[PDB]
Design a protein around this nucleic acid. Sequence first.
RNA 1: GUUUUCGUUGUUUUUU
Lengths: 263, 133, 339, 49, 113, 51, 66, 204, 49, 185
Amino acid sequence: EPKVNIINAQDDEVELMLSDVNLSLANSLRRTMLAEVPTLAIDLVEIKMNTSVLADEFISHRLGLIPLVSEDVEEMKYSRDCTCEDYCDECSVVLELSARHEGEEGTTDVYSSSLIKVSGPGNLNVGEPVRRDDYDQGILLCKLRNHQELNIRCIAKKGIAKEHAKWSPCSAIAFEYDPHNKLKHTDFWFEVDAKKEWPDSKYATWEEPPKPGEVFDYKAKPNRFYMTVETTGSLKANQVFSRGIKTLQEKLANVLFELENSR
Amino acid sequence: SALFDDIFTVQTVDNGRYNKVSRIIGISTTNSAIKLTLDINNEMFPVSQDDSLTVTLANSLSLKSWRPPKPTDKSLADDYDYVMFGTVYKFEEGDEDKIKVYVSFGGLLMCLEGGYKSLASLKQDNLYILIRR
Amino acid sequence: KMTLRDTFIEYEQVMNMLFWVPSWDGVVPQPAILKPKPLWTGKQLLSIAIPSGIHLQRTDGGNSLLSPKDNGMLIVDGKVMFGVVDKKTVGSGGGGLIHTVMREKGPKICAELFGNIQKVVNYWLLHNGFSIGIGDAIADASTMKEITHAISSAKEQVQEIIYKAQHNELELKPGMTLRESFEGEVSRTLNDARDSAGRSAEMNLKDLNNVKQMVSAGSKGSFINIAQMSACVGQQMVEGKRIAFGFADRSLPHFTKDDFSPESKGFVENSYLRGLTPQEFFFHAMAGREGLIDTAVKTAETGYIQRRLVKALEDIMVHYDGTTRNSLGDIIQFLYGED
Amino acid sequence: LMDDDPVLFNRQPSLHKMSMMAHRVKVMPYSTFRLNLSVTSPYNADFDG
Amino acid sequence: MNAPDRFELFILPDDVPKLKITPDSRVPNCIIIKFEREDHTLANLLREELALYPDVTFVAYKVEHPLFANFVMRLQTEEGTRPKQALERACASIINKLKTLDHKFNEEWNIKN
Amino acid sequence: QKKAMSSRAGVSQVLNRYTYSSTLSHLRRTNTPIGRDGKLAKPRQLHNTHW
Amino acid sequence: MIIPVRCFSCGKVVGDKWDAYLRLLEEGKQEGDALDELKLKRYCCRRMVLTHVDLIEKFLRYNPLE
Amino acid sequence: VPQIGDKFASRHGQKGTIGVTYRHEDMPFSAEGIVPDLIINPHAIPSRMTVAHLIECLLSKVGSIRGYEGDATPFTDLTVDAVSNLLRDNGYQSRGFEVMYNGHTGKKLMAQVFFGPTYYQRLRHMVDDKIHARARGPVQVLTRQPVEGRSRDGGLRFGEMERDCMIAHGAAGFLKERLMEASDAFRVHVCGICGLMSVIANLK
Amino acid sequence: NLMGKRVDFSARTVISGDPNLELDQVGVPISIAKTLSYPETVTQYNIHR
Amino acid sequence: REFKIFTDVGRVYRPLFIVEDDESKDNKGELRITKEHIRKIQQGYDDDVYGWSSLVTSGVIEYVDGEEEETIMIAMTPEDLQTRSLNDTAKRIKPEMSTSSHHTFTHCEIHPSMILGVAASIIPFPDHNQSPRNTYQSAMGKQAMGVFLTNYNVRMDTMANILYYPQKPLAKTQAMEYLKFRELP
RNA sequence: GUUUUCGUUGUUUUUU
Ligand SMILES: [Mg+2]
Ligand SMILES: [Zn+2]
Ligand SMILES: [Zn+2]
Ligand SMILES: [Zn+2]
């Protein structure tokens, strides 16, 4: 019964048309992709020696915010689920950084390229920092002056947007339906008139423009729901969507589990 | 359980400040001097001026935590178009032949003013009002 | 926004607030609307949060029994018959619902009803929401021009009073000297200007307008507030006076000597929407600093007043006899409040 | 100090005797005093610090 | 220096359970279900799913406090089905809906790009 | 210091560097050292000449 | 100083655009079209780059102890 | 880092503390799924009446969409209506309203929310610098009473009006222990003839 | 020092709004509810707790 | 029947644009300073230096005190310099000029927005909000968090506060440009 | 070693 007609697709941005679903279910899925989809982000930073002019908390928190290419973050075990003392590779990808400036007058631009993935449990390709792309030399991390050094090691562990926006698989997810307010969910507040003061959505062409004669059916419920999902490069749109679906499935499965567990 | 039965021709309607409800005032087709004023959700069952509506005042619709309305419980309501539940809040035992029964249906006010005995049986607490077109 | 006649709620939201309502008996009553679809009204939701055994009845503005405006007030045993509950009843007003629970049920029941209404309102607004916008604060151009012409007419009346005073044609008011009569009557005229403009703006406030909805809700704001924001601020009255000519026979070097016209003496010709001219901006600065200095000064004297009054009567107590006496036993009054 | 512990409740200034009120402690996180909206009005105070 | 922690929003303490059902004799065939480590995401979904169930006579939930990732849901069903059983039915129904969602999404994603 | 009495206090104060303006504006004050000997509003009230 | 790694209002990868943004600035170019070239679609992401104030260049032009 | 209770202010006198912090998923989103960084009380506008704040937010939206620095110099010729027209040109509602969708349900909130950027400022006052509890600490050398000052574990100075209100409250034992156990309390041995503390005293 | 003097078991902190809280309760920080305490005498009923 | 000259220390002066007050030319009711002087200043030098003292000593701008101000009549904006001879709800108001058909303003401020202060030059449209709130803004502006100095690190101060990410305001004044608020926001 | 030890004058600025 769940029906989708994907308008457009891309590595990060996707516009989908999920029809024949519940509004509450659709919102729950949107929340799951926004917060409960796991990614990899730096959660521990050691500064071995630093001669820059910036705080180490600054650079550490920024490093945490950096998305890491995380198509396989599911295989990574949690720092609390994994039984090992301290960190092992299976629950922790190690990153490294070492940069210097020597040219006196000048500045060495430390980029996320300098963040070198020096671990990652074979294979489990998680931990390499996301960038715009290859020609882009990476996310800029620091600016080095005469005789200034950044030497850092990093521990990245599996995480979600719910515990930090640095693990957030998405920036924002657009969720829409009823592109003409034919279901009467918003007032069209107005100073002169309601239909003309309020524009027509990009999905106005998709569903029918409401018949002026047609009296509102007080039993119809929202059925066609438009979705727009974007990722930061740590994951892909399809990955985030599927992970959210499966995560809410396993949430319901555990709810079952505890239901018959209590009885 | 259909204590009172009548049909009314609607003479006036006004929404005013309220948009989803209009107060409607009509005279009874069956017998004049029987005036019916009722606040109605317009978009849910619309009526207009001079509209003839089949009004029934019932003491009991069952022929208590309200449940999703089960079709297994038949209602005289199903015989009508707009059905509205309320409480008779004043039985106006006034004029010689003008009982003015005021019933509040959760806020929607109704005045049935007319015959003394024709409305005397309406000396109840709650009320079901049932409307065919 | 809730008690209104055309407020409609559906089974799911109903049941959700019922679970939210602390004073719900697990039993939802029959919805007022049942067919062709069961729908619920604001009054029944109110009565759900209300524990039974509370009746109230107040005719409002001489309203009738059929209450077309949903005005008036009638709660029966915790069930609202007609009338929208307002701050005149849910606030601290005497005879109010809180007064009623004080004098019928006690303080615990009032604490319960506070929680009831607070949580159900949290739900209902969380799900609806109510806001404010610039379009709410603006009225159509017709009322804007009514405002403009009201101010202009008041200015013309001011100029007429100026001419009468400047040629002694102004008839002397009782206990009010000629120049001061001029100043005071012009003050009255310009306050009438601001109030007329404001009342026009209030009239042009619309139903969806969250501004009139704010004042009618009464959560904050008032008439004069809208008058100043939308129509015009009006004369900056300091300690019940008018902004005088601070310089030599002038209030600003941009005005002239004996510039009896309003702009040179502190009457605001703009609203908070429009923004104010530098001269009258400085005049509103006059009024604002006046208010702040009034507060700051009044602090210390009101304080020592309070302290000395507390010192004055620190031991008056009604003894078990019922007579009000001193520590000496000399009776001030044989009974408390004569009763 | 547990939850529901009655404690004297005081604001400066305190003009009326209704400015002294006995509230039940509800041990809950954050370093502020969490209150009802209605009880703030007699205090004529706000949460601007 | 007093604010609560963040991992507890989903991590179950030993003493309290994920699911604590108590009988709601307030109306027949009703219970009160305490879901720790939960919020609106699952709560509203299960609420709507149960509301779609004809047996379910009362369905509601409330996040008693937003400063705690938890909620409690009151569920009454008809005299035939038990509230708990209606809950497993709702969970399994949403399971199958999610399966269909993921399948259709994946298929049209593949055919799309 | 011997004539501690009848001495004006506050003409020199520690420069604030909480913010940059905490210096700049701090360097462009004026003061009227009359004292609250007689409260009055004239030393505190804005005047048209202050325009 | 220093553009945020992640967009405060939204959360988009934005950090690796500053040098590109300056490149776009150099050719006497309008601001908004350049930001659009930088894939800055959400005006939150747009003013985050538009109104960011980097300050390390004065800090770095200080001769450090080492 | 900000926390519940932290003090902040606008450029329009709009000052307040944090009441609660909510995550992305629970707060409503726009049609494009955009949530605000911060939420304020509407009740300020009827009371505090900051029109310039509205103009600032409008110009902020316009500038962020158009990507330039907006001017707000006082005593200039700018008109709000033109800015609304440009916002129409920006493909956005002229009065800045936009439908939010309840974060908990995704349902279109009935009103269209005025939603956009504003320039705000952090303020020196925090919450955790005033949190201070004292059951027993250092006492002043002379008074033998709890010291004053949050630096040195200061006690709450009980004002005289608080005493008076407690007296009107019938708080005899409470105020007594506030002055007996919570304050200075020494026992001495006085004479019954002269009635003075003129007694060499030795308990042991 | 006599009509005004400091007390112990007293705390002073920020106030915040709690719409879901009861009127006669104040949301007390764990710091305040911990540092501040009441002396409960050991009785036969409270011995366990 | 008096006259008075003051050169004592402490009398404060503001530079007023010199509207020709001697009625002998069309510049009477206009500014001696013109777009020629503006262009010369825009050069930063003189076309054979034109500094600020150049404008002051050229007689097109002069210093004025309050005691002088109460004896002079000043134009607010460049609009009312020449004595003038519809229905817009987004504009301010100049003197009506109904009986006083003529006005020979001896001067005009460089900008009415210069009646403000250093802090006041920060607020976006401080003229659309209540004066008490303007005063509260002024008071709170000095205690608002920000970034004070570039070499905060080399200073050993009782308290130092530096923002992670200073941001230039979307809403700006023009005196802002002079305040360099883009550089220390 | 249970236990266990800081303060004031004056000055400025502040805080609903
Ligand atoms: Mg206070
Ligand atoms: Zn491990
Ligand atoms: Zn953004
Ligand atoms: Zn003796």
